């Protein structure tokens, strides 16, 4: 339920060298990228959103800011290493995930903000910024990496948990009493690690037997355990 | 070695563990139909079971696989060896291998060498978790002392497994305790039945407790057979800490 | 709708009109021309345009405004009627092509081409020989023409694109033949070809014609008498070679493959690069085969081999990638022949790697190929024959009079 | 270190008429800035030297633009700036052969401009001696008039804090002036130079969607330059209009300055 969605946000990252008639000719020129959040978080939801680009391409992955609080307060000379060799390596994409005394953090976070800005560099790179709510991050943050536009992760609209489950099961044996809306209809806010952890403890209890086939009651039965498990605590 | 003949009790849970760990070594077919991926491995939180390292040596001896500690306890500590590119190496060489630490198992220097170590192995389990040189690779955490709050604060069982281990079998107290009685030189006399299931409340480590602290009275009366009343005193010099 | 729902900027003509000069850039104006057909500001821009250019330039600004004019008969007629019965010779031969090139159900312009071509030793019936039977040929079992044509195979001219037109002409005419052909003209053109072993061109230009008249073979036996009969010197073995090249279709034949894979250690060096070559023609459908480690090796010549074999396709990144090691030689043969295949095999990524080519380079042929891309950077027989019959630009400049009006395109 | 690279300035960038309400000031540094270069001979007959410069601090509003500024509008060869921030590293000691390499280079140059930026990264003197061997061995190398005397002084600060370069600068800085805040008719100019781009409709007043945006910076204004132009492409149109965006600007200003 988010092709037009995905291939949206799919056209506004790849508009940067490819297709350059429409790029550089009439004066695009978006040099900020975008900035994501999922509710659920995770990292494999917005891992399996950006990773369309990850196909053709080259990648650098940092997750967490902890390289920052579990030592000295260095400051911001880690982000101007991968400043530089995001220069040295122009062809690439940048990607931050799980971005969470008082005086040192303003101050590299004003610095971090300057830079991030790149008030003396142009177009070269990409970079795109999670985390897991927008909420606890400050504001200020918004303008130099979201100026050309911002998504939110939808609901369960019935066809995205659908085709991903299409794409689960494509090589699957699964019976025909297994029907699918109650399953996409019942979840919510469950990431594609969620329904495919529910998939592999179903086809590994349905194992116990010698069962190539996996049923309805034992998926539902292996569901428990999630369903049960994240109300435990 | 440490096979099965000489560890016994948690039938269900190797019955449970023969998925999590025996899935990459007998049938990795199931990687289509299932989906499965590597996991970060499991643990056993709850009073010592008197062959938490046994179990673990059991089942890399039925696996044909090397066993690697972090620690070191027993002179491999810096046989294998900044210290830590080392272990990924042998572990890329030698796929098959099971990681347990027993050493592990003063605040301001021990927490210092202990802090680097734990920050040796996140780093490592960032490698790991990063990237992949191979399969068959899982490490084991042991939550069985008190100093142990690390592994069971930063494993409460969201992205990693979790095994309720306070009552095991009762065979942790019974049959291992058998098996204890079966190295040693036993009688034929005996009953470790009541002796074995009279002891409850204190902890799981009775038979270390009891077998350890016969040998005190088996080496007071220097008897060549150890009889049942020698573990009847066991229990209470045991009991007398609590 | 071409003309409704979209429309090309004019700084096409501007720069690539703007930067002509040296005789060269002119002929690449005259490929942006002859194959721009919304716009047609070049062609309505005075006069002297044509008579700046050389005499390839010549035939390929005649038959332009044929190219551009493949609708409106009348306009075409209207339109290409005033270079007809002129006063030189490339102007009414490229206007009897043009003639050819506008139409390819019309038929009405044989009577005057073919009406004169009965000289037989020189005249300008020649050259209106080559365009009208050129165009003719592309505008086509027919037998009035190629009995007709059999005076022209037997008159053999000393220049080339006679008998190569002549036999390009009746083998686009007889391409997809139930299970091929023995007849008598072809037979009778082998005879010819065997009578003097001079002027290796016709055993090169010749066996085009011959395999696309066996083209559409599905159980023919006619390679296997060509390795009969045709088995000699290797200059007509390198024309049982090209049967071979127009032999292999497509089946479960994996005998060609370990033979194939046998036969790449032969001395002679062209059978390898034909022969080779058909890997682009035999699978094109998988793919995933057609990447080996044949760039690793030290024949250049198999570089082209594979330069040539990646093809027209959706160009995924892996052509492109061994568009990125074979863009930097310096022979201008493969230097020339790799932005060809580079600009077809993606036809929207063109402008960086011209960008690449202005910071390798900065000859002429260079120069004037590299704004041939600028222009066209941007399963039938008849998109088929006309690349294959370019497999042979390494040669004099008599060829760029024919490489301007390819139909390999839409 | 990346202060050897990102040292040298190219790349002109925005023009002089982009000033942040500045009409004063932008003379009091322009006569120092561009009028000694303009006319050499002119201070040297006319009076002894040339003035040394000036100094701007307190607000940051459109700071560290002002000089780049001045680096798009040199007539002759654009001058080189050097940051603070690269100063302060572990492993000290670099600071003396980088400011002996940065200032031979500056004589290589035939006594050229040197700005110095970010002063509050290695100020605020108030375990720090490895710093006061950089800040007092820039000062040393400034005040000295061994390399040159005349050339350029002028320091963007955010925070006044600094004891010993407030106490050091009446020796060759001078010009204590403010930063000088844009004003709410300062922007007119900036979109009227701004509007050399893609021919705009002349329906959109300057001074009203200059006089709707509060508290904008100059990148933050440059940015909104951009947007217009960007948000007026997004379209798939060949016109910007004022009722095409003005929602993308209140919003972005009003909505991104809650």
């Given at each position: 339920?988010?092709?037009n969605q995905?291939?949206?946000?799919?056209?506004?990252?790849?508009?940067?060298?490819?297709?350059?008639?429409?790029?550089?000719?009439?004066?695009?020129?978006?040099?900020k990228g975008v900035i994501?959040?999922?509710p659920?978080?995770?990292?494999?939801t917005?891992?399996?959103?950006?990773?369309?680009?990850?196909?053709?391409?080259?990648?650098?992955?940092?997750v967490?800011?902890?390289?920052?609080?579990?030592?000295?307060?260095?400051?911001?000379?880690?982000v101007?290493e991968?400043?530089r060799?995001?220069?040295?390596?122009?062809?690439?994409?940048?990607?931050?995930?799980?971005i969470d005394?008082?005086?040192?953090?303003?101050?590299?976070m004003?610095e971090?903000?300057?830079?991030?800005?790149?008030?003396?560099?142009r177009?070269?790179?990409?970079?795109?910024?999670?985390?897991?709510?927008?909420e606890?991050?400050?504001?200020?943050?918004?303008?130099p990496g979201?100026?050309?536009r911002?998504?939110?992760?939808?609901?369960?609209d019935?066809?995205?948990?659908?085709?991903?489950?299409?794409?689960?099961?494509?090589?699957?044996?699964?019976?025909?009493?297994?029907?699918?809306?109650?399953?996409?209809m019942?979840?919510?806010?469950l990431?594609?690690?969620?329904?495919?952890?529910?998939?592999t403890?179903?086809?590994?209890?349905?194992?116990?037997?010698?069962?190539?086939?996996?049923?309805?009651?034992?998926?539902?039965?292996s569901k428990?355990?999630?369903?049960?498990?994240?109300?435990?605590? | 070695?440490?096979?099965?003949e000489?560890?016994?009790?948690?039938?269900?849970?190797?019955?449970?563990?023969?998925?999590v760990?025996?899935?990459?070594?007998?049938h990795?077919?199931?990687?289509?139909?299932?989906?499965?991926?590597?996991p970060?491995?499991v643990?056993?939180?709850?009073?010592?079971?008197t062959?938490?390292?046994?179990?673990?040596?059991?089942?890399?001896?039925?696996?044909?696989?090397?066993?690697?500690?972090?620690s070191?306890?027993?002179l491999v500590?810096?046989?294998?060896?900044?210290?830590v590119?080392?272990?990924?190496?042998?572990a890329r060489?030698?796929?098959?291998?099971?990681?347990?630490?027993?050493?592990?198992?003063?605040?301001?220097?021990?927490?210092?060498?202990?802090?680097?170590?734990?920050?040796?192995?996140?780093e490592?389990?960032?490698?790991?978790?990063g990237?992949?040189?191979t399969?068959?690779?899982?490490?084991?955490?042991?939550?069985?002392?008190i100093?142990?709050?690390?592994?069971?604060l930063l494993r409460?069982?969201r992205?990693?497994?979790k095994?309720?281990?306070?009552?095991?079998?009762?065979?942790?107290?019974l049959?291992?305790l058998?098996?204890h009685?079966?190295?040693?030189?036993?009688?034929?006399?005996i009953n470790?039945?009541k002796?074995?299931?009279?002891?409850?409340?204190?902890?799981?480590?009775?038979?270390k407790?009891?077998?350890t602290?016969?040998?005190?009275?088996?080496?007071?009366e220097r008897?060549?057979?150890v009889?049942?009343e020698?573990?009847?005193?066991?229990?209470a010099?045991?009991?007398?800490?609590? | 709708?071409?003309?409704?729902?979209?429309?090309?900027?004019?700084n096409?003509?501007?720069?690539s009109?703007?930067?002509?000069?040296s005789?060269?850039?002119?002929?690449a104006?005259?490929?942006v021309?002859?194959?721009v057909?919304?716009?047609?500001?070049?062609?309505?821009?005075?006069?002297?345009?044509?008579?700046?250019?050389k005499?390839?330039?010549?035939?390929?600004?005649?038959?332009?405004?044929?190219?551009?004019?493949?609708?409106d008969?009348?306009?075409?007629?209207?339109?290409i009627?005033?270079?007809?019965?002129?006063?030189e010779?490339?102007?009414?031969?490229?206007?009897?092509?043009?003639?050819?090139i506008?139409?390819?159900?019309?038929?009405?312009?044989?009577?005057?081409?073919?009406?004169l071509?009965?000289?037989?030793?020189?005249?300008?019936?020649?050259?209106?020989?080559l365009?009208?039977i050129?165009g003719?040929?592309?505008?086509?079992?027919?037998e009035?023409?190629?009995?007709?044509?059999?005076p022209?195979?037997?008159?053999?001219?000393?220049?080339?694109?006679?008998?190569?037109?002549?036999?390009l002409a009746?083998?686009?005419?007889?391409?997809?033949?139930?299970?091929?052909d023995?007849?008598?003209?072809?037979?009778?053109?082998?005879?010819?070809?065997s009578?003097?072993?001079?002027k290796?061109?016709y055993?090169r230009?010749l066996?085009?014609?011959?395999g696309?008249?066996?083209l559409?073979?599905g159980?023919a036996?006619?390679?296997?008498?060509?390795?009969?009969?045709?088995?000699?010197?290797?200059?007509?073995?390198?024309?049982?070679t090209?049967?071979?090249?127009?032999a292999?279709?497509?089946?479960?034949?994996?005998?060609?493959?370990?033979?194939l894979?046998?036969?790449?250690?032969?001395?002679?060096?062209?059978k390898?690069?034909?022969?080779?070559k058909?890997?682009k023609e035999?699978k094109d459908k998988?793919?995933?085969?057609?990447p080996?480690?044949?760039g690793?090796?030290?024949?250049?010549?198999?570089?082209g081999?594979?330069?040539?074999?990646m093809?027209?396709e959706?160009?995924?990144?892996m052509?492109?990638?061994?568009?990125?090691?074979?863009?930097?030689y310096?022979?201008?043969?493969?230097?020339?022949?790799?932005?060809?295949?580079?600009?077809?095999?993606?036809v929207?990524?063109?402008?960086?790697?011209?960008v690449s080519?202005n910071?390798?380079?900065?000859?002429?042929?260079?120069?004037?190929?590299?704004?041939?891309?600028?222009?066209?950077?941007?399963?039938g027989?008849?998109?088929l024959?006309?690349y294959?019959?370019?497999?042979?630009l390494?040669?004099?400049v008599?060829?760029?009079?024919?490489?301007?009006?390819?139909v390999?395109?839409? | 270190?990346?202060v050897?690279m990102?040292?040298?300035?190219?790349?002109?960038?925005?023009?002089?008429?982009?000033?942040?309400?500045?009409?004063?000031?932008?003379?009091?540094?322009?006569?120092?800035?561009?009028?000694?270069?303009?006319?050499?001979?002119?201070?040297?007959?006319?009076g002894?030297?040339?003035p040394?410069?000036?100094l701007?601090?307190?607000?940051?509003?459109?700071?560290?633009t002002?000089?780049?500024?001045?680096?798009?509008?040199?007539?002759?060869?654009?001058?080189?700036?050097?940051?603070?921030?690269?100063?302060?590293?572990?492993?000290?000691?670099e600071?003396?052969?980088?400011?002996?390499?940065?200032f031979?280079?500056?004589?290589?140059?035939?006594?050229?401009?040197?700005?110095?930026?970010?002063?509050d990264?290695?100020?605020?003197?108030?375990?720090?001696?490895?710093?006061?061997?950089?800040?007092?061995?820039?000062i040393?190398?400034?005040?000295?008039?061994?390399?040159?005397?005349?050339?350029?002084?002028l320091?963007?600060?955010?925070?006044?804090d600094?004891?010993?370069?407030?106490?050091?600068?009446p020796?060759?800085?001078?010009?204590?002036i403010?930063?000088?805040?844009?004003?709410?008719?300062?922007?007119?100019?900036?979109?009227?130079i701004?509007?050399?781009?893609?021919?705009?409709?002349?329906?959109?007043?300057?001074?009203l969607?200059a006089?709707?945006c509060?508290?904008?910076?100059?990148?933050?204004?440059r940015?909104?330059?951009?947007?217009?132009?960007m948000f007026a492409?997004?379209?798939?149109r060949?016109?910007?209009?004022?009722?095409?965006?003005?929602?993308?600007?209140?919003?972005?200003?009003?909505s991104?300055?809650?």
């Open positions: 339920g988010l092709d995905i291939q949206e946000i799919k056209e506004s990252v790849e508009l940067p060298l490819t297709h350059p008639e429409y790029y550089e000719e009439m004066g695009i020129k978006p040099p994501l959040y999922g659920p978080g995770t990292g494999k917005l891992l399996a959103k950006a990773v369309a680009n990850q196909t053709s391409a080259t990648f650098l992955r940092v967490g800011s902890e390289l920052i609080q579990k030592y000295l307060g260095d400051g911001p000379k880690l101007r991968l400043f060799v995001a220069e040295e390596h122009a062809p690439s994409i940048v990607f931050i995930d799980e005394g008082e005086r040192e953090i303003q101050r590299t004003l971090l903000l300057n830079q991030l800005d790149g008030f003396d560099s177009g070269d790179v990409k970079v795109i910024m999670a985390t897991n709510r927008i606890t991050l400050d504001p200020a943050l918004i303008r979201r100026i050309d911002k998504i939110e992760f939808p609901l369960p019935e066809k995205t948990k659908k085709r991903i489950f299409q794409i689960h099961t494509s090589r699957m044996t699964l019976a025909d009493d297994v029907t699918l809306d109650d399953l996409i019942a979840k919510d806010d990431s594609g690690a969620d329904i495919k952890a529910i998939c403890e179903a086809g590994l209890m349905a194992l116990r037997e010698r069962r190539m086939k996996v049923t309805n009651e034992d998926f539902k039965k428990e355990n999630v369903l049960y498990k994240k109300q435990e605590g | 070695d440490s096979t099965y000489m560890i016994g009790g948690l039938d269900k849970q190797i019955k449970e563990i023969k998925e760990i025996e899935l990459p070594v007998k990795p077919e199931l990687f289509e139909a299932l989906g499965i991926a590597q970060k491995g643990l056993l939180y709850g009073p010592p079971g062959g938490k390292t046994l179990l673990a040596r059991a089942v890399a001896h039925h696996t044909d696989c090397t066993f690697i500690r972090v070191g306890s027993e500590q810096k046989f294998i060896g900044r210290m590119r080392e272990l990924f190496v042998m060489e030698h796929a098959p291998s099971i990681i347990f630490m027993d050493e592990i198992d003063r605040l301001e220097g021990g927490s210092g060498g202990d802090s680097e170590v734990q920050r040796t192995m996140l490592l389990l960032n490698q790991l978790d990237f992949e040189a399969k068959n690779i899982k490490v084991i955490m042991a939550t069985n002392r100093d142990i709050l690390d592994s069971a409460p069982g992205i990693d497994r095994i309720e281990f306070p009552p095991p079998n009762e065979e942790a107290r049959d291992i058998k098996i009685s079966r190295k040693m030189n036993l009688t034929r006399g470790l039945r002796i074995a299931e009279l002891m409850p409340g204190a902890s799981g480590a009775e038979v407790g009891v077998c602290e016969a040998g005190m009275y088996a080496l007071r008897r060549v057979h009889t049942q020698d573990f009847e005193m066991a229990v010099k045991v009991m007398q800490k609590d | 709708d071409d003309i409704y729902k979209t429309h090309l900027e004019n096409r003509f501007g720069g009109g703007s930067q002509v000069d005789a060269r850039m002119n002929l104006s005259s490929f021309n002859g194959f057909n919304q716009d047609k500001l070049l062609t309505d821009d005075g006069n002297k345009w044509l008579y700046k250019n005499d390839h330039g010549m035939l390929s600004a005649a038959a332009s405004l044929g190219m551009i004019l493949l609708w008969v009348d306009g075409g007629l209207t339109q009627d005033k270079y007809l019965y002129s006063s010779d490339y102007i009414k031969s490229g206007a009897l092509l043009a003639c050819g506008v139409n390819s159900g019309v038929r009405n312009e044989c009577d005057p081409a073919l009406a071509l009965s000289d037989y030793v020189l005249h300008n019936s020649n050259t209106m020989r365009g009208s050129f003719l040929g592309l505008a086509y079992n027919r009035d023409v190629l009995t007709l044509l059999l022209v195979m037997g008159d053999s001219k000393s220049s080339m694109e006679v008998a190569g037109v002549t036999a009746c083998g686009m005419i007889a391409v997809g033949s139930c299970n091929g023995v007849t008598s003209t072809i037979l009778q053109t082998i005879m010819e070809k009578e003097t072993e001079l290796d061109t055993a230009w066996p085009l014609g011959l696309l008249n066996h559409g073979k159980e036996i006619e390679a296997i008498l060509a390795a009969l009969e045709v088995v000699s010197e290797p200059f007509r073995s390198f024309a049982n090209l049967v071979d090249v127009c292999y279709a497509g089946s479960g034949n994996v005998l060609k493959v370990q033979q894979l046998h036969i790449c250690s032969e001395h002679f060096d062209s390898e690069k034909e022969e080779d058909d890997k035999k998988d793919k995933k085969e057609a080996a480690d044949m690793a090796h030290q024949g250049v010549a198999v570089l081999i594979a330069l040539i074999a093809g027209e959706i160009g995924a990144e052509a492109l990638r061994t568009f990125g090691h074979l863009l930097r310096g022979e201008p043969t493969l230097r020339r022949a790799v932005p060809l295949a580079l600009a077809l095999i993606s929207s990524h063109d402008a960086d790697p011209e080519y910071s390798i380079f900065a000859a002429r042929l260079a120069a004037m190929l590299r704004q041939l891309a600028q222009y066209h950077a941007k399963k027989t008849l998109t024959c006309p294959h019959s370019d497999r042979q390494m040669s004099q008599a060829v760029a009079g024919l490489l301007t009006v390819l390999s395109f839409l | 270190p990346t050897t990102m040292q040298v300035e190219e790349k002109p960038d925005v023009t002089y008429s982009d000033v942040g309400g500045c009409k004063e000031q932008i003379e009091k540094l322009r006569e120092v800035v561009e009028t000694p270069l303009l006319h050499p001979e002119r201070f040297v007959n006319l002894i030297e040339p040394k410069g000036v701007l601090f307190g607000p940051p509003g459109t700071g560290k002002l000089c780049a500024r001045a680096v798009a509008n040199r007539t002759d060869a654009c001058f080189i700036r050097v940051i603070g921030s690269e100063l302060v590293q572990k492993y000290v000691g600071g003396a052969r980088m400011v002996r390499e940065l031979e280079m500056a004589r290589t140059k035939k006594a050229c401009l040197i700005f110095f930026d970010e002063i990264a290695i100020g605020g003197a108030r375990g720090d001696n490895e710093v006061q061997r950089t800040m007092l061995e820039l040393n190398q400034l005040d000295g008039f061994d390399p040159r005397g005349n050339i350029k002084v320091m963007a600060t955010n925070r006044p600094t004891l010993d370069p407030a106490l050091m600068r020796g060759r800085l001078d010009r204590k403010e930063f000088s805040l844009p004003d709410l008719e300062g922007r007119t100019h900036i979109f009227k701004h509007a050399r781009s893609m021919s705009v409709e002349r329906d959109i007043r300057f001074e969607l006089r709707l509060p508290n904008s910076t100059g990148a933050e204004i940015s909104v330059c951009t947007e217009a132009g492409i997004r379209a798939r060949k016109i910007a209009t004022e009722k095409d965006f003005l929602e993308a600007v209140n919003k972005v200003i009003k991104y300055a809650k």
